[PDB]
Every structure is written in structure tokens, then in C-alpha cells.
Amino acid sequence: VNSFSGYLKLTDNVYIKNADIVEEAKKVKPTVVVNAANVYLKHGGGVAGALNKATNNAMQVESDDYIATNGPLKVGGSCVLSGHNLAKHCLHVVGPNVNKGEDIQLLKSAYENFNQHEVLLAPLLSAGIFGADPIHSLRVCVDTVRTNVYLAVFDKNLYDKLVSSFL
Numbered sequence: 001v002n003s004f005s006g007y008l009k010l011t012d013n014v015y016i017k018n019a020d021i022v023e024e025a026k027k028v029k030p031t032v033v034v035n036a037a038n039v040y041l042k043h044g045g046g047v048a049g050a051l052n053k054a055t056n057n058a059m060q061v062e063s064d065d066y067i068a069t070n071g072p073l074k075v076g077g078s079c080v081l082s083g084h085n086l087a088k089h090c091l092h093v094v095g096p097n098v099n100k101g102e103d104i105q106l107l108k109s110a111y112e113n114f115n116q117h118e119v120l121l122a123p124l125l126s127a128g129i130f131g132a133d134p135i136h137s138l139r140v141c142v143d144t145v146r147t148n149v150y151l152a153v154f155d156k157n158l159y160d161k162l163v164s165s166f167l
């Protein structure tokens with residue numbers, strides 16, 4: 001039993017809700033919140049910009065030190081950093097950005113990072129400003145993640161479409 005509330009159950013391990021991931025994180029304080037990161041951990045917009053803003057830019061400061069030490073992530077890769085005031089940990093995961101020409105096949109690799117964590121609050125990878133089809137992202141999530149994932153979909157209209165079209 002955990003403290004996630006109001007989610008629709010999609011499968012044994014995947015749950016979905018129309019919610020602002022920032023507000024969800026502030027309420028639940030999950031062990032792991034997933035950020036929709038880029039390889040530079042530059043948290044400018046989308047989910048990443050919103051999460052970083054909620055940390056008063058502390059996420060960005062930590063991220064800049066991480067990159068200065070380690071260099072960029074790989075598309076499809078991840079790193080674990082602090083969750084600041086939002087969660088114990090933030091798993092920064094890089095899905096392919098279609099608006100950059102990156103290979104959508106890397107979306108499965110990106111979701112594989114979730115399997116290293118027993119429970120996660122997460123957005124749909126490569127959706128929104130990353131330019132992939134969110135219906136496809138949901139399918140890859142369901143077919144790749146085996147741990148317990150609570151998906152926050154910001155856009156209510158998109159949420160309804162994802163539920164109604166889910167196979």
C-alpha cells in the first residue's frame with residue numbers, strides 16, 4: 001500500500017491520472033519522481049522547467065555540478081540526483097526528442113531506467129515538447145516498465161484520449 005490517490009489502474013503495475021506532476025510530488029513526496037530531462041540537464045521547459053522552478057532552481061544548480069563532473073547523459077540514459085523539496089530522489093531520464101531528430105526506438109531504452117526503482121511518479125517520456133505521440137509513449141511504458149509506475153498527465157484533454165484509446 002502507498003499514498004497515491006485517484007489513479008486509474010491500467011495494468012498490474014501502471015496507474016494513470018490527470019495531474020500536474022509538480023503538485024502531485026508536493027503532496028505525495030514519493031521516493032522517486034522522474035524528470036523528463038535532456039542530456040545537458042538544462043531544465044528550461046516542459047516537465048523539467050516546472051520541476052526545477054518548484055525547487056527554486058536548486059535542481060538546476062545540482063545538475064550543473066553533475067554535468068561539470070560527468071559530462072552529458074546519453075539519449076535513453078538517466079541519472080539519480082536529489083529530489084529536493086519534491087521527492088527523496090529525482091530520476092532524470094532522457095527520452096528521445098523528436099523535434100531534434102532523435103531515434104524514437106530509444107524510448108524503450110529510456111523507460112528501462114524505471115525498472116531500477118520499485119515505485120515511481122513519472123510523466124510520459126518523449127511526450128509534450130519532446131514531440132512524440134503520447135499514445136505510443138504510454139504503450140512503450142506499459143510494455144517495458146515492470147515496477148510500479150504512477151503516470152501524471154498534465155493535459156486533461158490528452159488524459160481522456162489516453163484512457164479511451166488504451167488497449
Ligand SMILES: OCC1(Nc2ncnc3[nH]ccc23)CCCC1
Pocket residue numbers: 019020021022046047050122123124125127128129152153154155158
Ligand atoms: O506527462 C507528460 C506531459 N507533461 C507534464 N505532465 C505532468 N505534469 C506536468 N507538469 C508540467 C508539465 C507536465 C507532456 C504533455 C502533456 C503531459
